[PDB]
Symmetry: C3
Subunit: 67 residues, 3 copies
């Protein structure tokens, strides 16, 4: 089943994409929480921002692998 | 065995994942609108944060039920 | 059966594209939140682009 293998590969790439996406979503929720507490400009916000950017790049590569 | 059935289960769980994801993204966009208005400490912000956490949990479990 | 799964995967790919666009917009908005630019016009146009990407993602997810 060659078509089955193609579908399996696309689903694998979607799985890793959703993994990085969930990490990015937790990161953005924590960033919004820090905004709520008032620490809009703090080292925690910078670290979370860089982590969200790397998660977005990883998810972008994973979604590029699907096509 | 049941290969295409497993594929269909993955796709169904991904559909639920995308549904909760879109709810979460709407919540996040309203949160950032409130940030632009300066309601980062209001009660509406807290309710939206709670709803976003709920959507994040639902998306997390829906993506966990994919393997 | 297989054609249906392939159509589902195509719609999911469109969803992932619109989703990447929305995520980039949201991260740029969070950057604007830092350094104290929560009121700039860049924030406003980024909110507009985020609404557009969100509606595109909804249309793409309805096709699944």
């Amino acid at each position: 089943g060659k078509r089955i293998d193609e579908i399996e590969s696309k689903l694998k790439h979607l799985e890793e994409f959703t993994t990085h996406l969930i990490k990015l979503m937790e990161t953005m929720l924590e960033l919004l929480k820090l905004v709520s507490d008032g620490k809009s400009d703090s080292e925690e916000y910078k670290e979370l921002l860089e982590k969200a950017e790397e998660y977005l790049k990883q998810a972008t590569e994973a979604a590029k692998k699907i096509g």
